[PDB]
Amino acid sequence: LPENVDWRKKGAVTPVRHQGSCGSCWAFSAVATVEGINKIRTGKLVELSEQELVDCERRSHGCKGGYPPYALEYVAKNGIHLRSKYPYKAKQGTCRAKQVGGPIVKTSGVGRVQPNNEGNLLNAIAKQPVSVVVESKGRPFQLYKGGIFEGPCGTKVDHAVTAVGYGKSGGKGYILIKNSWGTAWGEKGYIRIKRAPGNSPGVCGLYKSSYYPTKN
Template identity: 55%
Template sequence: MESKLLMLLFLLGTVACSANDHRDPSVVGYSQEDLALPNRLSDLFTSWSVKHRKIHASAEVKARRYEIFKQNLRHIAETNSKNGTYWLGLNQFADISHEEFKASFLGLKPGLARRGAQPHASTAFRYENAMNLPWAVDWRTKGAVTPVKNQGECGSCWAFSTVAAVEGINQIATGKLISLSEQELMDCDNTFDHGCGGGLMDFAFAYIVGSQGIHTEEDYPYLMEEGYCREKQPHSKTITITGYEDVPENSETSLLKALAHQPISVGIAAGSRDFQFYKGGVFDGACGTELDHALTAVGYGSYNGQDYITMKNSWGKNWGEQGYVRIRRGTGKPEGVCDIYKIASYPTKNVT
């Protein structure tokens, strides 16, 4: 069984090398040579463990992780054999089960708005009458996107999505790209949001408005866990926003109108193994059953007839396309692939 899986992986790598898109020639994150050299899958697991600095507490733990690794590798190989518009690869999540992944690395909680007070977003949609949208937008090339960050084993995606959107509008308004503090939201925005336990971007925007700003990442660095709130720091810089607005639900056109003007916080149903191991391409595969993760839309475009929206994730650069994912658009589904048009919002700020 192991030899058959290795052969499948090698053949997939050979096919991928001749692909006419941006497909990684190592469909599982390793070169053809890497896949041809090991005599056993255990050697591939060892090299992967070294690459991702995985340390196992005991032989029993290592054996259990190895079995999960093989199951995940088989899913990656079988998915890539279908030769779709996207492909999967080995990443830092390869030795954890899908249930463990969902429990530790997601974190969007749209239900908070039902259990607590409703976020008071403006009822206006300032981009409603936007016309003549550019055929493509990439806020990374416009200098409005900070480098990809890593939330780690903590359900703080909502904080990273919020911060990325605020970083974007602040750069657009002031011309200065400043990395801001997810940790402040983790520690201080706790009326309705719950740190590693999950949260919602609108509540986080409301916190920033009510607190007269958010600190920089340099002054308030990320800890990957909830800490003591240090909201008031003398002689430290804060970045303000004037408010926030929701994008009309289930409207691709509305999201594109907003995204043409600034980065947008977006909820997504990311609880699938395909999304867990996404490596590249235009994603239109299996999604989760509910909105459970938060990303930041930073552009849109088209490649080989495939229209997509570019999303910034917070799982580090080893995931996806250097930390980004392209989600297919133009499918005709009101909610979009993985429900990306259900919950989207953005901060507002006066131009200075």
């Protein structure tokens, strides 16, 4: 695979956002992967609506969490609106998907990374942004303000974020994660999580559950 990939270098990653007052990480992560395969297949970076998935993705639970593959299923069946035509309110509303103008971004299906294995994950990352899970409940994670993150954390994953790159940095393997906690957190909104090698739940269960949208 390439030894280092950064989708931000590619123009495939939109600015860091903030969830505000809502458990919508599932939606923000599915959004970010969909922006990325979007820019990769079409050349156009656009920002898409997290609020469409909070209000319309009925299998997820709004502002009380959700599941990145369901969201990704949602986009494959229904496509998904411009963040500007269906703006983010940080609470669960009724689904307005029908009433919103602008172009729909559409995908065709969902890719499941075979979990618990480093190279499977990077093979996916080396092709596009991937939705992954992490255990975020640990103080070290919530107070993370930069460096290669090795824990401590457990594998009780509770938070969906987006793998937007991976690489080696003054010799450690990491994965480059876009969080949705604002640019105040971590390295201006990103985290570099230590790569466990081969077959592993990953640092902080980083390998336990990886999905991406398929398109074009």
